[PDB]
Amino acid sequence: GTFEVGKNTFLLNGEPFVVKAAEIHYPRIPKEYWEHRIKMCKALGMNTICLYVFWNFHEPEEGRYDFAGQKDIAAFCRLAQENGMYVIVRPGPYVCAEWEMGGLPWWLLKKKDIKLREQDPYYMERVKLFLNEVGKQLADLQISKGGNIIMVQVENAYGAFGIDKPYISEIRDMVKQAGFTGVPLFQCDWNSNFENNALDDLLWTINFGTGANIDEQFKRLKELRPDTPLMCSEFWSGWFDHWGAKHETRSAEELVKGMKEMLDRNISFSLYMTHGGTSFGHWGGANFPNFSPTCTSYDYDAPINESGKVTPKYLEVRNLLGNYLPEGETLPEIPDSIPTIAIPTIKMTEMAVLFDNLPHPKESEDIRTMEAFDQGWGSILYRTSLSASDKEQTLLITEAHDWAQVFLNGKKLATLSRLKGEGVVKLPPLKEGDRLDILVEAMGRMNFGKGIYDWKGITEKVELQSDKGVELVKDWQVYTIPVDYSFARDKQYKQQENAENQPAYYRSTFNLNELGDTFLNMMNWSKGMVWVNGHAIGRYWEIGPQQTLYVPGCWLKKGENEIIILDMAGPSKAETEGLRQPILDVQRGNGAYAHRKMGENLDLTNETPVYQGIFKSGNGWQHVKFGKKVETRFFCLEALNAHDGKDFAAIAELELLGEDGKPVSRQHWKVIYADSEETDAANNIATNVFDLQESTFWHTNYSSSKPAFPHQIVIDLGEDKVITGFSYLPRAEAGKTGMIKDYKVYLKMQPFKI
Ligand SMILES: OC[C@H]1O[C@H](O)[C@H](O)[C@@H](O)[C@H]1O
Ligand SMILES: [Ca+2]
16 A cells, blocks of 8 residues: 655545544554444544554663563554554654653663663664664564554654754664655654754654644745645644643643534544543653653543543534544444443551562662662652761752652651652751651652753752751662562561551452452552552642542452552552542642632832733744843733733743843743633633643633732742843734733742732
């Protein structure tokens, strides 16, 4: 067969063909259910499956490649072929995907000066070798060799990382050298950045979300390439969740409207995610703002939910896609759901306290990261002894990646979270030889932007601060606590209760006479991870919004089953249970879910704006130069009205421009104040202005208080910076509220009055 880029169309075996693809991810779906999920995608109206290849899933240790069982990507593609569906493969080497390090293997970071997603010779050689392995698995499944693979993506959304055409060209060449020479190669990006890395000989595709202004997404592309076929390579069907935040949803009605608009113009798309599944085990990622780890669940509000079930969105999409079939044809029947069971209360009566079950220590004079000790995943304990002190001191940990508990002679003093930028602990007076323990749990490595440079453990150093000065702390005992099931199983379990909330493994067995999917209730538990019959189910955290872990019935057995829970901070009750429905929407954070509280009223009365302006109407980036340089710690944008004359303001992204006229780093930014936020009907929290996601936005309240203009957002830059201008991106939809018109900008060194 053939697949070709034609004149305003794709051609499948010489005939016009509109790609209607479903994104599903083989590691996020138990292998026993691959067929069921593919059949769900076919019944929805799709003709193609789109998938990433996840490098770190196949080469978790250097030189050791695995493509068996759950990792059998060729078997996955053949299953799609057997069900009459084409495949698009996106082999990376970086895939983002809310997945550990964006698919990159942690062991790259053993080279401390490595450069990632650039032509670093060590990185590039490992990429070459990995792609070659993918080629041996998949090149013979190109449509041109009798298989079903129709296109291959080169890299992934490089426009959101940098500008490096020689890099992308070399990746393209490595994809070809691996054997992918028979089908079109393409690169994806946003409508705002695709030109930066666009190569003459690749197809250019665009990614955007439910509700986007479709014409705006493709207009510039058609000025450059009047005859290119148009494809949305990721049409976001929903969104992912962050630990501590609200469960995300997106409108089915809006999705269908955009899908219809594309299909009425024969525009191709791949729906991301069509079924998301679960980031099982340690494989979940982390992204912006700051460090924001993503939930274990990848339900995504996709049409096919986490456990493979029909949703109202599925039914709306199917109703639409049923009208776009070659004449005569009807959609296949929707597969039956996989049965569910409830599992009665499981009492976790056996426990092995972590600090009483430690491995052999490595002695290290200096702090080093976990990768320096040949550890990629899990937790790491750093232990030392301290000198006598009659006065209190401060312990400075620089920096804990990601969630550290500090103990003194076994008594917990504090918890330090990277989500909160924490690194300081007050120590009481010390006796000579007092034992300091810093247990650092590593969550996923960041999967987006420059966050992929994510070394775990303590990144640099530990210091003691007294009135005398600051002293580096040396002479450590280091204990690797790996995620391997074998490590969790090999512990001295005893019938015991956790009086002191110490980190511990908990074990129980339970009988089952009939099997089905279930949802393990973690509401009683603190933070940690779970194994069921050896299978690593994923991470949990009491802050939510996710409170249940999906447990596939194919990982349960008749007769005796085993559950082990690693719980870091102690459960409120040492019991769990299996529910027939998940809990995905229960937050239990510290403080109100808002950037304004009682008694806060921003007062601009004695402030003079740096700039007053008017934004243009409609969609797309706007860049503003102030014609001067201002040293800034705090930035306030005061929106005065909107283009529609209504009471709401919204912002998708804000950047501030430095002395060189380019965006400053937002790594350390903080929203100090937003006058109003919608957090009930949607998750339009104010940090959405710096998550590097053009599909997410801050929006003022509309569901209850619905306050009028003026509206304001105040940002702490986290450091003093010389600012020359700023950039504003409104929400991506057409015809919606909150398109700011008149505005003022204020820049200060001292705090605003709030
Ligand atoms: O879900 C958000 C989405 O963002 C980008 O489009 C990436 O290419 C995807 O891998 C995914 O991370
Ligand atoms: Ca955003």
